[PDB]
mmCIF file of N, CA and C in Angstrom:
data_model
loop_
_atom_site.group_PDB
_atom_site.id
_atom_site.type_symbol
_atom_site.label_atom_id
_atom_site.label_comp_id
_atom_site.label_asym_id
_atom_site.label_seq_id
_atom_site.Cartn_x
_atom_site.Cartn_y
_atom_site.Cartn_z
ATOM 1 N N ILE A 1 0.819 -0.937 -0.456
ATOM 2 C CA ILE A 1 0.151 -0.056 0.138
ATOM 3 C C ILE A 1 0.942 1.108 0.214
ATOM 4 N N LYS A 2 0.816 1.944 -0.659
ATOM 5 C CA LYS A 2 1.251 4.054 -0.983
ATOM 6 C C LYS A 2 -0.275 4.867 -0.474
ATOM 7 N N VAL A 3 0.422 5.667 0.556
ATOM 8 C CA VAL A 3 -0.777 6.743 0.652
ATOM 9 C C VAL A 3 0.481 8.066 0.267
ATOM 10 N N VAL A 4 -0.454 8.829 -0.440
ATOM 11 C CA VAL A 4 0.062 10.922 -0.639
ATOM 12 C C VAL A 4 -0.837 11.616 0.137
ATOM 13 N N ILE A 5 0.166 12.646 1.198
ATOM 14 C CA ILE A 5 -0.544 13.692 1.664
ATOM 15 C C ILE A 5 -0.266 14.578 0.533
ATOM 16 N N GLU A 6 -0.274 15.826 0.492
ATOM 17 C CA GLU A 6 -0.352 16.822 -0.196
ATOM 18 C C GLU A 6 -0.557 17.875 0.498
ATOM 19 N N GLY A 7 -0.635 19.139 0.097
ATOM 20 C CA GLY A 7 -0.975 20.795 0.384
ATOM 21 C C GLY A 7 -0.053 21.871 0.704
ATOM 22 N N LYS A 8 -0.787 22.572 1.403
ATOM 23 C CA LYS A 8 0.101 22.964 1.794
ATOM 24 C C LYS A 8 0.924 22.951 2.721
ATOM 25 N N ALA A 9 2.071 23.526 3.191
ATOM 26 C CA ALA A 9 3.714 23.122 4.156
ATOM 27 C C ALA A 9 2.822 23.062 5.196
ATOM 28 N N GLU A 10 1.933 24.825 5.807
ATOM 29 C CA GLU A 10 1.757 24.691 7.171
ATOM 30 C C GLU A 10 0.693 23.819 7.772
ATOM 31 N N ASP A 11 -0.680 23.457 6.605
ATOM 32 C CA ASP A 11 -1.131 22.426 7.308
ATOM 33 C C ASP A 11 -1.099 20.871 7.585
ATOM 34 N N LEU A 12 0.245 20.557 6.594
ATOM 35 C CA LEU A 12 0.850 19.756 6.891
ATOM 36 C C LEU A 12 1.581 19.331 7.911
ATOM 37 N N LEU A 13 2.250 20.428 8.351
ATOM 38 C CA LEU A 13 3.078 20.918 9.512
ATOM 39 C C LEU A 13 2.027 20.797 11.359
ATOM 40 N N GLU A 14 0.607 21.426 10.958
ATOM 41 C CA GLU A 14 0.095 21.120 11.878
ATOM 42 C C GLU A 14 -0.878 20.133 11.933
ATOM 43 N N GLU A 15 -1.539 19.500 11.445
ATOM 44 C CA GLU A 15 -1.638 17.682 11.485
ATOM 45 C C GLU A 15 -0.481 17.122 11.739
ATOM 46 N N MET A 16 0.960 16.862 11.756
ATOM 47 C CA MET A 16 1.976 16.596 12.132
ATOM 48 C C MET A 16 2.539 17.206 13.863
ATOM 49 N N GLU A 17 2.072 18.367 13.889
ATOM 50 C CA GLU A 17 2.334 18.649 15.211
ATOM 51 C C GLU A 17 1.051 18.519 15.648
ATOM 52 N N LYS A 18 0.035 18.236 15.970
ATOM 53 C CA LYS A 18 -1.460 17.876 16.617
ATOM 54 C C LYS A 18 -0.366 16.127 16.884
ATOM 55 N N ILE A 19 -0.002 15.275 15.941
ATOM 56 C CA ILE A 19 0.138 14.367 16.866
ATOM 57 C C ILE A 19 1.516 14.002 17.689
ATOM 58 N N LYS A 20 2.637 14.653 17.054
ATOM 59 C CA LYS A 20 3.812 15.483 17.256
ATOM 60 C C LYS A 20 3.744 15.386 19.311
ATOM 61 N N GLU A 21 2.608 16.668 19.205
ATOM 62 C CA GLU A 21 2.068 16.268 20.782
ATOM 63 C C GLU A 21 1.486 15.142 21.238
ATOM 64 N N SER A 22 0.916 14.660 20.522
ATOM 65 C CA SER A 22 -0.316 13.382 21.489
ATOM 66 C C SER A 22 0.455 12.472 22.133
ATOM 67 N N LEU A 23 1.339 12.188 21.315
ATOM 68 C CA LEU A 23 2.937 11.279 22.064
ATOM 69 C C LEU A 23 4.037 12.424 22.846
ATOM 70 N N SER A 24 4.324 13.713 22.587
ATOM 71 C CA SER A 24 5.356 14.261 23.268
ATOM 72 C C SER A 24 4.503 14.630 25.118
ATOM 73 N N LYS A 25 3.313 14.256 25.028
ATOM 74 C CA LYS A 25 2.629 14.193 26.513
ATOM 75 C C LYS A 25 3.412 13.652 27.534
ATOM 76 N N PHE A 26 3.573 12.132 26.847
ATOM 77 C CA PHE A 26 5.294 11.622 28.076
ATOM 78 C C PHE A 26 6.743 11.980 27.679
ATOM 79 N N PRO A 27 7.366 12.321 28.303
ATOM 80 C CA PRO A 27 9.228 12.358 28.082
ATOM 81 C C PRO A 27 9.822 11.123 27.885
ATOM 82 N N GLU A 28 10.251 10.860 26.964
ATOM 83 C CA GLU A 28 11.322 9.847 25.870
ATOM 84 C C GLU A 28 11.740 8.664 26.543
ATOM 85 N N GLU A 29 11.157 8.626 27.797
ATOM 86 C CA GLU A 29 11.517 7.431 28.698
ATOM 87 C C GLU A 29 10.796 6.499 28.992
ATOM 88 N N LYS A 30 9.801 7.559 29.537
ATOM 89 C CA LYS A 30 8.222 6.975 30.184
ATOM 90 C C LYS A 30 7.586 5.726 28.061
ATOM 91 N N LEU A 31 7.886 6.867 27.508
ATOM 92 C CA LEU A 31 7.562 5.957 26.035
ATOM 93 C C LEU A 31 8.441 5.125 25.516
ATOM 94 N N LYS A 32 9.240 5.032 26.641
ATOM 95 C CA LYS A 32 10.465 3.760 26.483
ATOM 96 C C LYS A 32 9.398 2.214 27.444
ATOM 97 N N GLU A 33 9.606 2.826 28.616
ATOM 98 C CA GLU A 33 8.671 1.921 29.020
ATOM 99 C C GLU A 33 7.552 1.408 28.270
ATOM 100 N N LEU A 34 7.001 2.075 27.807
ATOM 101 C CA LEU A 34 5.223 1.610 26.924
ATOM 102 C C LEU A 34 5.825 1.389 25.884
ATOM 103 N N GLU A 35 6.984 1.217 25.135
ATOM 104 C CA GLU A 35 7.331 0.232 23.740
ATOM 105 C C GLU A 35 7.910 -0.813 23.959
ATOM 106 N N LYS A 36 7.959 -1.230 25.752
ATOM 107 C CA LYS A 36 8.440 -2.315 26.130
ATOM 108 C C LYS A 36 7.669 -2.813 26.766
ATOM 109 N N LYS A 37 5.675 -2.325 27.186
ATOM 110 C CA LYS A 37 4.841 -2.751 28.011
ATOM 111 C C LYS A 37 3.820 -3.433 26.681
ATOM 112 N N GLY A 38 4.106 -3.302 25.626
ATOM 113 C CA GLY A 38 3.662 -4.202 24.445
ATOM 114 C C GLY A 38 2.212 -3.297 23.794
ATOM 115 N N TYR A 39 2.519 -1.748 24.397
ATOM 116 C CA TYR A 39 1.634 -0.932 23.705
ATOM 117 C C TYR A 39 2.192 -0.185 22.518
ATOM 118 N N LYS A 40 1.145 0.372 21.626
ATOM 119 C CA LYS A 40 1.982 1.038 19.892
ATOM 120 C C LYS A 40 1.503 1.655 19.822
ATOM 121 N N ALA A 41 1.666 2.623 18.837
ATOM 122 C CA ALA A 41 0.479 3.617 18.273
ATOM 123 C C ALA A 41 0.601 3.080 16.683
ATOM 124 N N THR A 42 -0.834 2.752 16.560
ATOM 125 C CA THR A 42 -0.926 2.085 14.561
ATOM 126 C C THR A 42 -1.999 3.627 13.771
ATOM 127 N N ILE A 43 -1.550 2.826 12.536
ATOM 128 C CA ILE A 43 -2.150 3.834 11.491
ATOM 129 C C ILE A 43 -3.161 2.656 10.663
ATOM 130 N N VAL A 44 -4.169 3.588 10.609
ATOM 131 C CA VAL A 44 -4.970 2.721 9.839
ATOM 132 C C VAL A 44 -5.162 3.434 8.647
ATOM 133 N N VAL A 45 -4.919 2.765 7.350
ATOM 134 C CA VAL A 45 -5.373 3.370 6.219
ATOM 135 C C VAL A 45 -6.709 2.616 5.794
ATOM 136 N N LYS A 46 -8.069 2.720 5.875
ATOM 137 C CA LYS A 46 -9.027 2.681 5.253
ATOM 138 C C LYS A 46 -9.442 2.672 4.717
ATOM 139 N N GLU A 47 -9.368 1.626 3.281
ATOM 140 C CA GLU A 47 -10.151 1.913 1.499
ATOM 141 C C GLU A 47 -11.224 2.401 0.999
ATOM 142 N N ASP A 48 -11.750 4.048 1.905
ATOM 143 C CA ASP A 48 -12.557 4.835 1.780
ATOM 144 C C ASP A 48 -11.749 6.400 1.729
ATOM 145 N N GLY A 49 -10.422 6.117 1.411
ATOM 146 C CA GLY A 49 -9.616 6.937 1.440
ATOM 147 C C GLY A 49 -8.952 7.521 2.768
ATOM 148 N N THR A 50 -9.271 7.604 3.536
ATOM 149 C CA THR A 50 -8.666 7.577 5.128
ATOM 150 C C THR A 50 -8.029 7.456 5.793
ATOM 151 N N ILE A 51 -7.143 8.481 6.659
ATOM 152 C CA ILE A 51 -5.992 7.689 7.363
ATOM 153 C C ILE A 51 -6.416 7.826 8.657
ATOM 154 N N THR A 52 -5.988 7.266 9.769
ATOM 155 C CA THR A 52 -5.647 7.453 10.861
ATOM 156 C C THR A 52 -4.791 6.935 11.595
ATOM 157 N N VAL A 53 -4.427 7.520 13.220
ATOM 158 C CA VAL A 53 -3.912 7.374 14.070
ATOM 159 C C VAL A 53 -3.770 7.119 14.893
ATOM 160 N N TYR A 54 -4.157 6.116 15.597
ATOM 161 C CA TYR A 54 -4.215 5.713 17.195
ATOM 162 C C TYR A 54 -3.187 5.824 18.152
ATOM 163 N N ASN A 55 -3.939 5.943 19.076
ATOM 164 C CA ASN A 55 -2.340 5.756 20.505
ATOM 165 C C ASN A 55 -3.247 5.054 21.219
ATOM 166 N N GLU A 56 -2.104 3.911 21.441
ATOM 167 C CA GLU A 56 -3.151 2.487 22.253
ATOM 168 C C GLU A 56 -3.057 2.509 23.620
ATOM 169 N N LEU A 57 -2.450 3.354 24.723
ATOM 170 C CA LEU A 57 -2.500 3.124 25.652
ATOM 171 C C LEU A 57 -3.114 3.994 26.227
ATOM 172 N N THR A 58 -2.621 5.384 25.465
ATOM 173 C CA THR A 58 -3.337 6.678 25.882
ATOM 174 C C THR A 58 -4.719 6.945 25.620
ATOM 175 N N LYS A 59 -4.766 6.034 24.377
ATOM 176 C CA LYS A 59 -6.112 5.575 23.328
ATOM 177 C C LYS A 59 -7.017 6.509 22.998
ATOM 178 N N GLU A 60 -5.993 7.248 22.205
ATOM 179 C CA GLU A 60 -6.444 8.205 21.192
ATOM 180 C C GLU A 60 -6.842 8.259 19.331
ATOM 181 N N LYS A 61 -7.451 9.185 18.798
ATOM 182 C CA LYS A 61 -7.906 8.828 17.941
ATOM 183 C C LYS A 61 -6.962 10.164 16.869
ATOM 184 N N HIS A 62 -6.259 10.815 15.922
ATOM 185 C CA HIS A 62 -6.769 11.405 14.500
ATOM 186 C C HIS A 62 -6.812 11.145 13.540
ATOM 187 N N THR A 63 -7.708 11.862 12.936
ATOM 188 C CA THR A 63 -7.945 11.142 11.402
ATOM 189 C C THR A 63 -7.705 12.476 10.205
ATOM 190 N N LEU A 64 -6.757 12.248 9.810
ATOM 191 C CA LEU A 64 -5.940 12.989 8.827
ATOM 192 C C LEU A 64 -6.599 13.968 8.116
ATOM 193 N N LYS A 65 -7.042 15.096 7.977
ATOM 194 C CA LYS A 65 -7.331 15.804 7.648
ATOM 195 C C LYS A 65 -7.564 16.802 6.071
ATOM 196 N N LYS A 66 -5.917 17.042 5.739
ATOM 197 C CA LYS A 66 -5.747 18.553 5.348
ATOM 198 C C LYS A 66 -5.020 18.381 4.556
ATOM 199 N N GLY A 67 -5.456 19.259 2.808
ATOM 200 C CA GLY A 67 -4.817 18.839 2.362
ATOM 201 C C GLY A 67 -5.568 17.828 1.417
ATOM 202 N N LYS A 68 -4.640 16.626 0.286
ATOM 203 C CA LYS A 68 -5.544 16.281 -0.490
ATOM 204 C C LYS A 68 -4.775 14.695 -0.140
ATOM 205 N N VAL A 69 -5.545 13.448 -0.033
ATOM 206 C CA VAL A 69 -4.292 12.447 0.105
ATOM 207 C C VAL A 69 -5.173 11.339 -0.658
ATOM 208 N N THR A 70 -4.134 10.393 -1.166
ATOM 209 C CA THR A 70 -4.026 9.865 -2.828
ATOM 210 C C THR A 70 -3.855 8.083 -2.266
ATOM 211 N N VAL A 71 -4.501 7.482 -1.837
ATOM 212 C CA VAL A 71 -3.957 5.843 -1.625
ATOM 213 C C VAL A 71 -4.046 5.334 -2.889
ATOM 214 N N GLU A 72 -3.190 4.530 -3.018
ATOM 215 C CA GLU A 72 -2.373 3.606 -4.280
ATOM 216 C C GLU A 72 -2.690 2.077 -3.415
ATOM 217 N N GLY A 73 -3.656 1.286 -3.930
ATOM 218 C CA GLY A 73 -4.008 0.015 -3.247
ATOM 219 C C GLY A 73 -5.192 -0.341 -3.064
ATOM 220 N N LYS A 74 -4.993 -1.371 -2.494
ATOM 221 C CA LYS A 74 -6.686 -1.966 -2.319
ATOM 222 C C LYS A 74 -6.583 -3.336 -0.575
ATOM 223 N N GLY A 75 -8.470 -2.613 -0.198
ATOM 224 C CA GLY A 75 -8.106 -2.873 1.391
ATOM 225 C C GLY A 75 -7.616 -2.344 2.436
ATOM 226 N N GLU A 76 -8.038 -1.712 3.427
ATOM 227 C CA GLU A 76 -7.864 -0.851 4.262
ATOM 228 C C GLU A 76 -6.161 -1.970 5.189
ATOM 229 N N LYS A 77 -4.934 -1.152 5.089
ATOM 230 C CA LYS A 77 -3.801 -1.412 5.806
ATOM 231 C C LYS A 77 -4.112 -1.029 7.702
ATOM 232 N N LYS A 78 -2.520 -1.494 7.810
ATOM 233 C CA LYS A 78 -2.155 -1.194 9.764
ATOM 234 C C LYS A 78 -1.252 -1.683 9.744
ATOM 235 N N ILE A 79 -0.924 -0.483 10.019
ATOM 236 C CA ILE A 79 0.545 -0.610 10.145
ATOM 237 C C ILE A 79 0.433 -0.154 12.174
ATOM 238 N N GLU A 80 1.766 -0.981 12.499
ATOM 239 C CA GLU A 80 2.053 -0.764 14.049
ATOM 240 C C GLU A 80 3.378 0.039 14.533
ATOM 241 N N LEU A 81 3.666 0.475 15.291
ATOM 242 C CA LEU A 81 4.559 0.725 15.468
ATOM 243 C C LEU A 81 4.924 1.331 16.932
ATOM 244 N N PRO A 82 6.621 1.061 17.545
ATOM 245 C CA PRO A 82 6.637 0.900 19.242
ATOM 246 C C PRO A 82 6.432 2.232 19.422
ATOM 247 N N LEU A 83 5.849 2.581 20.586
ATOM 248 C CA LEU A 83 5.888 4.090 20.753
ATOM 249 C C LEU A 83 6.866 4.877 20.821
ATOM 250 N N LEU A 84 7.983 4.828 21.429
ATOM 251 C CA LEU A 84 9.263 5.627 21.018
ATOM 252 C C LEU A 84 9.413 5.692 19.549
ATOM 253 N N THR A 85 9.940 5.283 18.952
ATOM 254 C CA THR A 85 10.028 4.939 17.402
ATOM 255 C C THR A 85 9.198 5.830 17.028
ATOM 256 N N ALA A 86 7.451 5.857 16.925
ATOM 257 C CA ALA A 86 6.700 6.807 16.738
ATOM 258 C C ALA A 86 6.947 8.139 16.981
ATOM 259 N N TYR A 87 7.606 8.561 18.453
ATOM 260 C CA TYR A 87 7.583 9.682 18.678
ATOM 261 C C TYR A 87 8.429 10.098 17.453
ATOM 262 N N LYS A 88 9.872 9.234 17.339
ATOM 263 C CA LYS A 88 11.031 9.851 17.192
ATOM 264 C C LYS A 88 10.699 10.085 15.183
ATOM 265 N N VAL A 89 9.489 9.265 14.812
ATOM 266 C CA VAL A 89 10.090 9.426 13.249
ATOM 267 C C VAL A 89 8.643 10.866 12.954
ATOM 268 N N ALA A 90 7.540 11.109 14.028
ATOM 269 C CA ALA A 90 6.455 12.065 14.512
ATOM 270 C C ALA A 90 7.758 13.392 14.370
ATOM 271 N N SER A 91 9.056 13.336 14.992
ATOM 272 C CA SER A 91 9.397 14.608 15.323
ATOM 273 C C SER A 91 10.080 15.030 14.031
ATOM 274 N N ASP A 92 10.747 13.937 13.389
ATOM 275 C CA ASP A 92 11.826 14.336 12.509
ATOM 276 C C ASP A 92 10.745 14.939 11.292
ATOM 277 N N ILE A 93 9.771 14.514 10.851
ATOM 278 C CA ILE A 93 8.913 14.885 10.038
ATOM 279 C C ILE A 93 8.368 16.321 10.311
ATOM 280 N N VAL A 94 8.007 16.828 11.779
ATOM 281 C CA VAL A 94 8.429 18.165 11.790
ATOM 282 C C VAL A 94 9.042 19.012 11.327
ATOM 283 N N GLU A 95 10.517 18.340 11.932
ATOM 284 C CA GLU A 95 11.548 18.814 12.148
ATOM 285 C C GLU A 95 11.892 19.335 9.926
ATOM 286 N N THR A 96 11.520 18.283 9.047
ATOM 287 C CA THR A 96 11.602 18.645 7.782
ATOM 288 C C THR A 96 10.701 19.697 7.370
ATOM 289 N N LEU A 97 9.466 19.905 8.267
ATOM 290 C CA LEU A 97 8.602 20.384 7.872
ATOM 291 C C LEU A 97 9.093 21.860 7.786
ATOM 292 N N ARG A 98 9.284 22.242 9.095
ATOM 293 C CA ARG A 98 9.893 23.477 9.588
ATOM 294 C C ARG A 98 10.992 24.146 9.726
ATOM 295 N N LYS A 99 12.076 23.268 8.780
ATOM 296 C CA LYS A 99 12.702 23.894 7.948
ATOM 297 C C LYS A 99 12.606 24.249 6.731
ATOM 298 N N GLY A 100 12.094 23.224 5.782
ATOM 299 C CA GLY A 100 11.567 23.838 4.408
ATOM 300 C C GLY A 100 10.376 24.991 4.568
ATOM 301 N N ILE A 101 10.105 25.087 5.578
ATOM 302 C CA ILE A 101 8.623 26.483 5.856
ATOM 303 C C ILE A 101 10.182 27.810 5.413
ATOM 304 N N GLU A 102 11.018 27.171 6.987
ATOM 305 C CA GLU A 102 11.948 28.739 7.513
ATOM 306 C C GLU A 102 12.438 28.776 5.620
ATOM 307 N N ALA A 103 12.821 28.182 5.289
ATOM 308 C CA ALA A 103 13.865 28.478 3.933
ATOM 309 C C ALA A 103 12.742 28.595 2.891
ATOM 310 N N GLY A 104 10.917 29.391 3.548
ATOM 311 C CA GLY A 104 10.696 29.903 1.944
ATOM 312 C C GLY A 104 9.502 28.731 1.194
ATOM 313 N N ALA A 105 9.108 27.250 1.304
ATOM 314 C CA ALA A 105 8.958 26.763 1.156
ATOM 315 C C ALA A 105 7.394 27.270 1.063
ATOM 316 N N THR A 106 6.603 26.593 0.593
ATOM 317 C CA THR A 106 5.129 27.129 0.366
ATOM 318 C C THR A 106 4.436 25.657 0.192
ATOM 319 N N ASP A 107 4.583 24.347 0.027
ATOM 320 C CA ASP A 107 3.777 23.270 -0.390
ATOM 321 C C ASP A 107 4.596 22.201 -0.530
ATOM 322 N N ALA A 108 4.213 21.290 0.988
ATOM 323 C CA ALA A 108 4.492 20.133 1.532
ATOM 324 C C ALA A 108 3.891 18.606 0.804
ATOM 325 N N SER A 109 4.765 17.759 0.943
ATOM 326 C CA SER A 109 3.873 16.291 0.994
ATOM 327 C C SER A 109 4.790 15.090 1.522
ATOM 328 N N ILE A 110 4.175 14.160 1.981
ATOM 329 C CA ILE A 110 4.600 13.468 2.623
ATOM 330 C C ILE A 110 3.886 11.930 2.423
ATOM 331 N N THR A 111 4.877 10.963 1.823
ATOM 332 C CA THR A 111 4.501 9.625 0.787
ATOM 333 C C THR A 111 4.884 8.435 2.217
ATOM 334 N N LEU A 112 4.153 7.671 2.344
ATOM 335 C CA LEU A 112 4.642 6.542 3.140
ATOM 336 C C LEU A 112 4.036 5.279 2.268
ATOM 337 N N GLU A 113 5.256 4.531 1.784
ATOM 338 C CA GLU A 113 4.866 3.083 1.685
ATOM 339 C C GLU A 113 5.360 1.965 2.597
ATOM 340 N N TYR A 114 4.554 1.183 3.040
ATOM 341 C CA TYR A 114 4.156 0.425 3.270
ATOM 342 C C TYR A 114 4.248 -1.013 2.865
ATOM 343 N N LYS A 115 5.550 -2.190 3.035
ATOM 344 C CA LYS A 115 5.355 -2.969 1.793
ATOM 345 C C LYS A 115 6.268 -4.044 2.296
ATOM 346 N N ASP A 116 6.251 -5.309 2.927
ATOM 347 C CA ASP A 116 7.161 -6.285 3.275
ATOM 348 C C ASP A 116 7.024 -5.813 5.014
ATOM 349 N N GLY A 117 6.629 -5.435 5.460
ATOM 350 C CA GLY A 117 7.048 -4.896 6.641
ATOM 351 C C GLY A 117 8.422 -4.163 6.846
ATOM 352 N N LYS A 118 8.682 -3.204 6.093
ATOM 353 C CA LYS A 118 9.030 -1.539 6.094
ATOM 354 C C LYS A 118 8.373 -0.595 5.908
ATOM 355 N N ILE A 119 8.403 0.144 6.626
ATOM 356 C CA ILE A 119 7.663 1.707 5.959
ATOM 357 C C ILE A 119 8.830 1.774 5.586
ATOM 358 N N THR A 120 8.133 2.781 5.133
ATOM 359 C CA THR A 120 9.213 4.013 4.285
ATOM 360 C C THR A 120 8.241 5.583 3.850
ATOM 361 N N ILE A 121 8.792 6.433 5.024
ATOM 362 C CA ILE A 121 8.448 7.865 4.955
ATOM 363 C C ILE A 121 9.251 8.453 3.576
ATOM 364 N N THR A 122 8.808 9.804 3.035
ATOM 365 C CA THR A 122 9.405 10.579 2.906
ATOM 366 C C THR A 122 8.544 12.096 2.715
ATOM 367 N N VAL A 123 9.334 13.053 3.017
ATOM 368 C CA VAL A 123 8.933 14.288 3.220
ATOM 369 C C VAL A 123 9.570 14.947 2.685
ATOM 370 N N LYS A 124 8.523 16.132 1.430
ATOM 371 C CA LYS A 124 9.013 16.912 0.592
ATOM 372 C C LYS A 124 8.858 17.997 0.398
ATOM 373 N N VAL A 125 9.497 19.449 0.878
ATOM 374 C CA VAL A 125 8.969 20.496 1.376
ATOM 375 C C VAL A 125 10.042 21.918 0.685
ATOM 376 N N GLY A 126 9.697 21.789 -0.976
ATOM 377 C CA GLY A 126 10.147 22.974 -1.930
ATOM 378 C C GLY A 126 11.027 21.978 -2.015
ATOM 379 N N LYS A 127 12.453 22.451 -2.243
ATOM 380 C CA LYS A 127 14.025 21.877 -2.106
ATOM 381 C C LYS A 127 14.073 20.503 -1.199
ATOM 382 N N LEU A 128 13.779 20.385 -0.236
ATOM 383 C CA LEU A 128 13.861 19.539 0.690
ATOM 384 C C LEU A 128 13.864 18.544 0.615
ATOM 385 N N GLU A 129 14.224 16.832 0.659
ATOM 386 C CA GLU A 129 13.784 16.123 0.620
ATOM 387 C C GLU A 129 14.793 15.193 1.817
ATOM 388 N N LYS A 130 13.575 14.639 3.150
ATOM 389 C CA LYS A 130 14.494 13.570 3.634
ATOM 390 C C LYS A 130 13.454 12.151 4.156
ATOM 391 N N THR A 131 14.121 11.003 3.843
ATOM 392 C CA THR A 131 13.161 9.630 3.281
ATOM 393 C C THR A 131 14.019 9.319 5.307
ATOM 394 N N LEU A 132 12.709 8.411 5.337
ATOM 395 C CA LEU A 132 13.027 7.412 6.274
ATOM 396 C C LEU A 132 12.090 6.418 6.767
ATOM 397 N N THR A 133 13.154 5.253 6.869
ATOM 398 C CA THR A 133 12.168 4.025 6.854
ATOM 399 C C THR A 133 12.666 3.236 8.409
ATOM 400 N N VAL A 134 12.227 2.332 8.570
ATOM 401 C CA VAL A 134 11.309 1.059 9.908
ATOM 402 C C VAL A 134 11.210 0.121 9.191
ATOM 403 N N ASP A 135 11.202 -0.606 10.921
ATOM 404 C CA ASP A 135 10.262 -2.244 10.797
ATOM 405 C C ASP A 135 8.636 -2.562 10.916
#
């Protein structure tokens, strides 16, 4: 499955900061506590075009909204991540979006490819491109 979110750089940065806060409630060593307690953070790509992010021990949902969303693939998919892993990935995306906007970028896009257990994220903010991969 492949999901792409496009739009204004600031809107994507807003969605991202909402999510990064929902996991920076806790300082990083308690997120480590939890990711070893068995509790996860989940992405759900509902096949009606919907993306939802879930926090499994503080038990919250935020459904992505801003800009245009593209899903290539059939069936809903579902990715689980350790809570500290999730916090690190969210912080990296916010940092690239911030550096991109700070250097004059107006339009951003974020691509998530989940295949074979490899999860790959690409943040493009004008001239900036960062790529992340995890298991």
